[PDB]
Design a protein around this nucleic acid. Structure first.
Lengths: 851, 141, 75, 43, 69
RNA sequence: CAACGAGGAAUUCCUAGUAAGCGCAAGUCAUCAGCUUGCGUUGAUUACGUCCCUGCCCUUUGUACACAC
């Protein structure tokens, strides 16, 4: 088969991520969906779209959504870009050659921050699962995983090798000793979430849910447990929403610091922090009226040391920001907003006055976007493309360059079409208005106010183009002719129900209209004849398509399935269930019975109309695919979605016993090696110090598991099971029994792991010598005789030491119970009433017996 | 958490008792007991058993409930016996009896201590095969 | 080892030694009587005499010497 | 006396004897103890 | 060696809203894991017949012959 | 001037009145006589262990009441 693929994607400038700024104002790296694009603020031309080397839609593209980019981060000097995606992976690229250097999957959910540290070679990454991982770049390895937060890492701040400090989407800020990787000090920052973190070395600043911004003093050289990071006071903002990024600078040329808190909505609150001279010369002024009350006033600091500044607003909702500074009169701040647009503002400040009632944007890159989701896409014969938006941004892109060359202002526009000669656009809006535009001249040929009483929903030209059909939610369809280049309403068909799709056949034959009442009706255009009524879809029914032979129609709806109908008798053929949310649009190919359907769950799907298979399952969008349009000839198809994207699609095993034996042999070899080393040390310290042994290096596996040999043998002796322990001890020969006795003799000098394994040592040792008693008492060596005596003394001392406190506790606890009894048990002198009282007050337990 | 990491078992013990973290309490008592066997009237270190000596009624009733359900093992029973012993030798016996609830605990853990006394006494009994093997090894010449 | 062609020498219990002794003697008498002039009684007599004195002219103790020598080899 | 279940709700008390507190268990042991309780319910 | 059930579960994990792939896979595993409708001889130096299919064509042939007579 | 002197690679079955040898009868509504089923006579070798390999199965709270583990 001649399958499909993706040629190019565009329409996005700023997506659901952050932005990094690079100096030459300068350029900007930001996110498109799953690929990063670089822009020069000066002009705004797309100078780079760094993308994955595999086209989404190819043979090896995997069966899921692609990983949306979610955090840009840049190493300036050594020229790297660490970008991180929504599945958790981190790709590190060199910006010179634009290839992938490092892949750093690691995480389990989407990631929220990156940071290079010690400028090169180290990258720390925080994610929507609460881990935060340190990575080395010279080893390609996750070094450390700091794991104690609970919800989602909202920010952190590190210095090199000793201290990190993170704050997460619970209420908690944490300080991490990066030598031990244990959390040192934990506070509750804000009572809900904690969304911000910034610090200029003395003061730390955090923000939470609503306007309460908290100043902290971190004293890194502190020694107390609670008090490495203390809280110094709160203050307020003007926004009652989530401040979610704070960032600082030190402008030179005096020395000064500025920080911003961007908000959820539309607003960045900028702040100047002042200097120690005006701290000292402002302290007395609030210390006026002359001291317990004045000390309470001086303690209740934030408004003192912090100074608000020019509160920069924007038109849309703010997603990310970053700035640069010179002279303290060029706080030059780039800002990517949600409705895709970047904006380069710059506030001046004459070091006392900010010299403006409201700041000024110096650049704005917004030409290659829409600011809303494209509710309708269209195409020329083959050359141009039509994108229809809610703000009014009709845009005429071109296929061969992916640049909008022509754009207008219409309104809440949901459907549009071209006109068959090209260079002319019809469009209908969500109120009762229709509009006409062109390509060479300006916007409005004419608008028709009161084109319909209510929301228009779908229009269609005839194949010659002179006559178009508009169906609207005022329960009417209308017909319009082109009189000479103006619209002529002549007839109108009022239905009982809100018509929401129209279509004609591609040979002027049928008019199929989709009603809100779960059905479609097929009419004859030449008679308004009411040929057919196709029924049985069971929810209101979206896009129709008529085939090129005018024999076969498709019918999409919100029932998550498309139905194929034969138009000769109105008989159904398939009812194939696609698309688990809602099929928004469905379109045939030009010459074939193959078709495409794009749906509300971020997927387009390629089907055939003969076997009714799914030919292909294309997976490049991220959100609700609102429209798609096929070429008139040739058959390449464009699809446009809710993530502001427009994309083209073209054609192409030991056991117990022997484990204990090998553990015993290496353990006792290490043990008597160290004992020979100690005898060598005593002889070369008691004799002429001219020589000694060189070095016994400790065993590989013993230093690899970090265990003394007694502990190594002790845990493998633990790890054999009780059912095969009497076999594990019976398999081993008498030489291993003798070195087992050496092992027990050494282990009851370390009285820590003697007392934690007393019954195990007793059981194993007594079975060993009880089984090997005949040979043991025939061995003739005073070393083993002294060994047995030493083991006997230390073992029996440990056992009598534990049963001493056992017997003590028995007699003490029964004394306690008995003195409680003789204090207040009861008063019976008569033995029969006494025994009946004790029988009524006894402990009962009921048992299931068999008779 | 910082005390349990860096060592320091007495203030770790009283924080585990205040927070009522029972597995951490067993760990701080087991670690302090093991290092008490290591180093060298007093059974824990002196600061920790003074910290046991100065806790009040509801704290020692939850401590003895912890000792009660640790004593049902034959493994975790030594820690329970050392804690019961230091409570017994650092508190007042009339106070311990007249605390409301301290008979439904000590009657629960008298028979378990008797079971362990029987088991460890039989271990001492069958520990004399070493003595028999030594008298044979000395008869060998 | 899954079929790694390596042999390991084992000892052999006395019931297996008596079993394999009677087997070696009798089938040696059969093949020694296979198509010669002698019968099974005379070949078995020669076999039992030579095996009694241990002459290394018998099938049976030549087979024993081969089995013991292979065990000595890949001991 | 035999070790039943805990008389609190932030506590988990196994019949071994080892009482664990839910505030002191990490999330790995929380998932592991939940699956183990699911096994002991399912049998 | 290993069970026909274990090999059948392995074949289902091997083969894994298309329809004809499932028609092909189901027909393939049916005519593979049905060994009693072929006949296999033993090569002295192997599917040698299809008994049920030969039987049904031999009896449908004489069935239509009998109805014709 | 054809075959053949105990039958290759592989493969199947088998543990005591068993494998195998031996004959004698019957012919029981299905099946069988190109044989089938009985009946006695003679009667062993080697395992009777093990989960190492190949597989198949079971359990993974001890519950059922002490003691013990």
């Amino acid at each position: 088969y001649q399958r499909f693929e993706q040629a190019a994607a565009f329409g996005v400038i700023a997506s659901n991520a952050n932005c990094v700024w690079i100096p030459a104002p300068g350029q900007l790296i930001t996110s498109a969906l799953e690929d990063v694009n670089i822009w020069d603020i000066k002009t705004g031309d797309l100078v780079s779209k760094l993308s994955d080397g595999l086209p989404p839609g190819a043979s090896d593209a995997r069966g899921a959504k692609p990983a949306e980019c979610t955090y840009l981060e840049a190493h300036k000097d050594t020229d790297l870009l660490a970008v991180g995606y929504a599945d958790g992976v981190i790709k590190v690229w060199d910006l010179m050659s634009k290839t992938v250097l490092l892949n750093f999957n690691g995480h389990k959910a989407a990631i929220t921050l990156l940071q290079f540290d010690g400028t090169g070679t180290r990258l720390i990454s925080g994610s929507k699962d609460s881990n935060i991982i340190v990575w080395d770049l010279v080893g390609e390895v996750g070094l450390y995983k700091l794991r104690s937060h609970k919800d989602s890492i909202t920010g952190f701040w590190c210095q090199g090798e000793d201290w990190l400090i993170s704050t997460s989407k619970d209420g908690m800020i944490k300080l991490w000793d990066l030598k031990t990787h244990q959390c040192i000090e934990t506070h509750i920052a804000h009572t809900g979430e904690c969304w911000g973190l910034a610090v200029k070395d003395d003061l730390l600043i955090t923000t939470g849910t609503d306007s309460q911004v908290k100043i902290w003093k971190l004293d890194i050289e502190n020694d107390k447990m609670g008090g490495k990071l203390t809280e110094m006071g709160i203050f307020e903002k003007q926004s009652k929403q989530r401040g979610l990024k704070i960032e600082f600078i030190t402008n030179s040329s005096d020395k000064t610091s500025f920080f911003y808190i961007q908000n959820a909505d539309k607003t960045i609150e900028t702040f100047r922090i002042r200097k120690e001279e005006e701290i000292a010369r402002g302290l007395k002024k609030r210390e006026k009226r002359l001291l317990t009350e004045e000390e309470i006033a001086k303690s209740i600091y934030s408004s003192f040391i912090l100074h608000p500044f020019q509160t920069i607003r924007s038109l849309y909702k703010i997603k990310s920001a970053s700035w640069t500074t010179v002279s303290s009169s060029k706080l030059e701040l780039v800002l990517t907003t949600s409705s895709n647009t970047i904006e380069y503002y710059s506030i001046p400040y004459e070091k006392r006055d900010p010299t403006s009632p409201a700041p000024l944007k110096t650049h704005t890159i917004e030409l290659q976007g829409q600011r809303t989701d494209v509710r309708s896409i269209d195409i020329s014969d083959d050359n141009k493309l039509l994108a229809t938006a809610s703000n009014g941004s009709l845009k005429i892109w071109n296929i061969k360059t992916h640049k909008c060359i022509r754009t207008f202002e219409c309104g809440y526009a949901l459907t549009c079409k071209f006109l068959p000669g090209g260079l002319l656009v019809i469009l209908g809006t969500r109120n009762g208005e229709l509009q006409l535009f062109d390509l060479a001249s300006s916007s409005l040929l004419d608008t028709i106010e009161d084109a319909h009483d209510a929301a228009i929903w779908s229009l269609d030209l005839t194949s010659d183009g002179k006559r178009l059909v508009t169906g609207s939610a005022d329960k009417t369809v209308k017909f319009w002719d082109f009189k000479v280049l103006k619209l002529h309403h002549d007839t109108t068909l009022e239905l009982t129900d809100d018509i929401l799709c129209v279509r004609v056949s591609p040979d002027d034959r049928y008019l199929a209209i989709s009603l809100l009442d779960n059905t479609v009706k097929v009419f004859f255009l030449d008679s308004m004849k009411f040929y057919l009524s196709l029924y049985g879809h069971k929810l209101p029914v979206l896009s129709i398509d008529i085939s090129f032979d005018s024999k076969m129609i498709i019918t999409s709806s919100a029932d998550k399935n498309i139905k194929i109908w034969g138009l000769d008798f109105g008989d159904c053929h398939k009812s194939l269930f696609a698309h688990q949310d809602s099929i928004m649009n469905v379109k045939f190919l030009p010459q074939s019975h193959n078709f495409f359907s794009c749906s509300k769950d971020a997927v387009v799907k390629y089907w055939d109309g003969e076997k009714f298979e799914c030919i292909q399952k294309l997976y490049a969008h991220q959100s609700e695919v609102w429209a798609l349009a096929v070429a008139t000839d040739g058959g390449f198809v464009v699809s446009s979605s809710h993530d502001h994207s427009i994309r083209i699609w073209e054609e192409t095993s030991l056991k117990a016993g022997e484990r204990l034996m090998e553990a015993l042999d290496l353990g006792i070899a290490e043990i008597e090696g160290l004992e020979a080393y100690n005898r060598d040390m005593k002889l070369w310290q008691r004799k002429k110090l001219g020589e000694a042994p060189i070095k016994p290096q400790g065993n590989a596996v013993l230093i690899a598991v970090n265990k003394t040999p007694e502990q190594y043998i002790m845990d493998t002796l633990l790890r054999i099971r009780m059912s095969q322990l009497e076999d594990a001890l019976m398999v081993m020969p008498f030489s291993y029994v003798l070195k087992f006795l050496k092992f027990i003799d050494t282990v009851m000098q370390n009285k820590t792991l003697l007392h934690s394994h007393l019954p195990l040592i007793c059981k194993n040792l007594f079975f060993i010598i009880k089984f090997n008693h005949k040979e043991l008492v025939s061995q003739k060596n005073e070393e083993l005789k002294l060994q047995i005596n030493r083991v006997k003394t230390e073992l029996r001392s440990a056992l009598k030491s534990t049963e001493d406190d056992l017997g003590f506790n028995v007699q003490g606890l029964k004394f306690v119970k008995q003195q409680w009894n003789l204090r207040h048990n009861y008063e019976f002198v008569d033995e029969y009433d006494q025994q009946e009282k004790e029988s009524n007050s006894a402990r009962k337990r009921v048992f299931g017996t068999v008779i | 958490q910082n005390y349990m990491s860096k060592g320091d078992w007495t203030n770790a013990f009283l924080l585990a008792m205040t927070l009522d973290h029972p597995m951490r309490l067993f760990n701080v008592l087991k670690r302090a007991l093991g290092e008490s066997r290591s180093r060298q009237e007093v059974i824990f270190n002196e600061e920790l058993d003074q910290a046991i000596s100065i806790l009040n009624d509801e704290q020692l009733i939850l401590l003895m409930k912890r000792c009660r359900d640790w004593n049902t093992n034959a493994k975790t029973h030594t820690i329970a016996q050392r804690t019961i012993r230091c409570i017994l030798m650092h508190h007042n016996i009339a106070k311990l009896s007249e605390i409301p609830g301290m008979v439904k605990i000590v009657d629960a853990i008298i028979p378990y201590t008797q079971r362990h006394f029987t088991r460890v006494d039989n271990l001492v009994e069958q520990s004399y095969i070493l003595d028999y093997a030594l008298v044979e090894m000395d008869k060998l010449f | 080892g899954g079929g790694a062609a390596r042999r390991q020498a084992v000892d052999v219990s006395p019931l297996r030694r008596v079993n394999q002794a009677i087997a070696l003697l009798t089938i040696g008498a059969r093949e020694a009587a296979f198509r010669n002039i002698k019968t099974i009684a005379e070949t078995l007599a020669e076999e039992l005499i030579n095996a009694a004195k241990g002459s290394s002219t018998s099938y049976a103790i030549k087979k024993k010497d081969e089995l013991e020598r292979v065990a000595k080899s890949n001991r | 006396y035999n070790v039943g279940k805990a008389e609190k709700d932030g506590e988990i008390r196994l019949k071994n004897g080892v009482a664990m507190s839910k505030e002191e268990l990490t999330r790995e042991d929380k998932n592991r103890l939940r699956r183990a309780l699911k096994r002991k319910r399912s049998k | 060696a290993g069970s026909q059930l274990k090999n059948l579960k392995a074949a289902l994990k091997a083969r894994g809203y298309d329809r004809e792939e499932k028609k092909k896979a189901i027909a393939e595993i049916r005519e593979e894991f049905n060994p009693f409708e072929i006949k296999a001889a033993r090569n002295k130096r192997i599917a040698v017949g299809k008994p049920g299919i030969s039987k049904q064509i031999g009896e449908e042939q004489r069935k239509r012959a009998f109805e014709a007579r």
